[PDB]
């Protein structure tokens, strides 16, 4: 952006993209995962269905939270971020920081753990790998930054 827009952005810490570095901001992503396992198990189905449901819902929720909405949910200066998602605002646009690394690693380990159960079905295995790769890591790369289709 131009000089005035950058000054407005830099004049105040972004309250909508700063909590991710605070205390407990890492263990929460692991804790929300253990609850999905105990809930989909409470549904009472076969292990593979529970695991695939867990993985799918986590990935979809993470995407709809960090990638779909643009801007700040309140007034910043004149908005100053009217066309940036929450993921792009992490660490004032600095890529491959420890936080970004952790949020990249999480889905891969999720798939590694879940694979052992639904591995014997081709359709579930293909769907899970497709959704993981295409709705996880891909928007989080450094090449898709500020890329609108």
């Amino acid at each position: 952006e131009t000089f005035e827009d950058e000054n407005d952005q830099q004049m105040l810490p972004n309250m909508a993209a700063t909590w991710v570095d605070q205390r407990g901001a890492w263990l929460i992503h692991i804790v929300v995962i253990v609850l999905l396992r105990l809930f989909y198990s409470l549904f009472g189905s076969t292990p593979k269905w529970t695991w695939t449901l867990t993985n799918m819902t986590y990935i979809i929720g993470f995407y709809i939270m960090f990638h779909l909405v643009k801007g700040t949910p309140f007034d910043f200066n004149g908005g100053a971020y009217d066309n940036l998602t929450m993921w792009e605002q992490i660490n004032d646009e600095t890529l491959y920081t420890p936080t970004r690394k952790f949020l990249l690693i999480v889905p891969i380990v999720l798939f590694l753990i879940s694979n052992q159960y639904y591995r014997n079905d081709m359709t579930l295995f293909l769907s899970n790998l497709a959704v993981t790769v295409l709705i996880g890591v891909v928007p989080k790369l450094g090449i898709t930054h500020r890329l609108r289709i």
Partner: peptide
């Protein structure tokens, strides 16, 4: 094809 996928995932995670 399973262990191939897992090994590729380990490479990319590193």
């Amino acid at each position: 094809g399973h262990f191939f996928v897992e090994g590729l995932l380990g490479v990319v995670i590193i």
